[PDB]
């Protein structure tokens, strides 16, 4: 422990999440990502089952990291005097969904369906584990290009899932729902569904629909690319202005546009290889 267990490589990226380095676990040459967070920048703290006081991000990652899933899993973590270091899986080769959509433009609906289905399964898995991500967006989704699997990252804005109202939010505003913009109040699942509507529009049109507060609360969805009427209907449903008018996850996955999804390996061979 701990500079002896891992070989550190190039900086992958930095920002509101911290600084993330490529790495290799010396034990077995498993590729990892090594994420450093400074203690002074951490706003939300939690307690591990053992009672150890850790960043909420560690709490949430531990709750979602058991078993296989579409979430980048936490393998280990360490406390330093001024920071926490998180050891995470690193699929290879990868590209995040933001860069993927930038380079390829609007995605074919078959490909958007496969990606969107996998994001729904991943978000369902988080909610089943008691975890609300609160920052679903293309920047927080990695694509394993060989396996055709999508992986959720960056739980640094998340929370334990509850059925009462949330009055705090630190995710991405252009993915946040109109009830947050207008009233600084939202419920977890219906807010998640809103961000998934933003994400689906992003995939099939090549960029997000709203950039300004007035557009978010105006709730008019102009389609800038050719999109089937069934996909348009699902998007507009997810972006219903009234939270209670939005679909549940079950209603999304039962939607006609969502049927006959490709398998992950079919998605890779057809669209990614």
């Amino acid at each position: 422990p701990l500079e002896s267990q891992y070989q550190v490589g190039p900086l992958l990226g930095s920002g509101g999440f911290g600084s993330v380095y490529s790495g290799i676990r010396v034990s077995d040459n498993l590729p990892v990502a090594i994420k450093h967070v400074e203690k002074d920048r951490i706003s939300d703290w939690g307690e591990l089952p053992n009672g150890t006081r850790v960043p909420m991000e560690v709490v949430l990652l531990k709750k979602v990291s058991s078993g296989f899933s579409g979430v980048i899993r936490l393998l280990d973590w360490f406390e330093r005097p001024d920071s926490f270091v998180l050891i995470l899986e690193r699929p290879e080769p990868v590209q995040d969904l933001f860069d993927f959509i930038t380079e390829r433009g609007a995605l074919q609906e078959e490909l958007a369906r496969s990606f969107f289905w996998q994001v729904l399964e991943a978000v369902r898995h988080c909610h089943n584990c008691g975890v609300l991500h609160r920052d679903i967006k293309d920047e927080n989704i990695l694509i394993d290009l060989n396996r055709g699997e999508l992986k959720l990252i960056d739980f640094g804005s998340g929370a334990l899932l509850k059925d009462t109202v949330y009055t705090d939010f630190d995710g991405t505003r252009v993915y946040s729902p109109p009830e947050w913009i207008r009233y600084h109040r939202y419920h977890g699942r219906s807010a998640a569904v809103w961000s998934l509507g933003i994400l689906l529009y992003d995939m099939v049109c090549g960029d997000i629909p709203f950039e300004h507060d007035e557009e978010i609360i105006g709730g008019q969805v102009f389609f800038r690319q050719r999109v089937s009427s069934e996909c348009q209907h699902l998007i507009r449903w997810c972006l219903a202005l009234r939270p209670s008018d939005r679909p549940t996850f079950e209603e999304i996955q039962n939607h006609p546009w969502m049927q006959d999804v490709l398998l992950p390996q079919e998605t890779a061979e057809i669209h990614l290889h």
Partner: peptide, 9 residues
Amino acid sequence: RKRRRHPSG
């Protein structure tokens, strides 16, 4: 048309 990332927070 400009496409951009959006920081969290």
